[PDB]
Amino acid sequence: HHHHHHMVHITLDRNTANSWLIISKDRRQVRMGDTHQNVSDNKERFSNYPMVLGAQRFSSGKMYWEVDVTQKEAWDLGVCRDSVQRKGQFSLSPENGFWTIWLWQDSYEAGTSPQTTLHIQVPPCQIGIFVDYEAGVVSFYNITDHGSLIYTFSECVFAGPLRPFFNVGFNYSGGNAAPLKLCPL
Numbered sequence: 001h002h003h004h005h006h007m008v009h010i011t012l013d014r015n016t017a018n019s020w021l022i023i024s025k026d027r028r029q030v031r032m033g034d035t036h037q038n039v040s041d042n043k044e045r046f047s048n049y050p051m052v053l054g055a056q057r058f059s060s061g062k063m064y065w066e067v068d069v070t071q072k073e074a075w076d077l078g079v080c081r082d083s084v085q086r087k088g089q090f091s092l093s094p095e096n097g098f099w100t101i102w103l104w105q106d107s108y109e110a111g112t113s114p115q116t117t118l119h120i121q122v123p124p125c126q127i128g129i130f131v132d133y134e135a136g137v138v139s140f141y142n143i144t145d146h147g148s149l150i151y152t153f154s155e156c157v158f159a160g161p162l163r164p165f166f167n168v169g170f171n172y173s174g175g176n177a178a179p180l181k182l183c184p185l
């Protein structure tokens with residue numbers, strides 16, 4: 001790929017965070033806390049999962065950013081509609097307004113309904129996410145493996161503004177405490 005030059009500076013929106021998340025002062029890192037983080041509830045917060053949105057909203061153009069997933073056992077990454085459901089249980093699918101991939105139990109999968117098996121030879125430590133709003137494309141790149149393609153969603157129905165989407169995953173095992181980090185340009 002040669003998408004790096006559509007690089008955008010993403011920051012995390014604390015107001016949208018699950019109440020157990022800890023977002024760094026620079027709003028570029030997020031991790032699962034070991035308790036409720038002493039914030040009030042609001043209608044924007046994801047209630048059931050350790051999810052948070054980026055502050056940026058996109059309705060046009062080409063956008064690219066990178067995320068560090070080093071030493072995590074579980075996470076979800078991608079984009080979603082600004083209007084996605086925040087409360088209760090739901091599945092990550094384009095029908096529900098999500099364009100995502102994940103790591104879970106030593107397998108990588110794309111968030112289609114049902115999920116799609118990914119084929120990655122080099123486990124990634126950093127993921128690139130590319131959105132072409134006009135083309136209806138969301139693509140994922142393996143930065144650890146020379147930028148090799150992981151997955152492309154095409155013919156996307158964004159149906160409104162998009163926000164960067166993150167899930168740090170649960171830490172039931174004690175092996176998934178590490179943060180998601182937005183990588184410098």
Ligand SMILES: CS(=O)(=O)NCCc1ccc(F)cc1
Binds near residue numbers: 034169172173
């Ligand atoms: C730190 S942990 O060992 O992963 N425990 C998770 C508890 C929890 C459950 C649902 C949430 F929406 C947020 C947190």
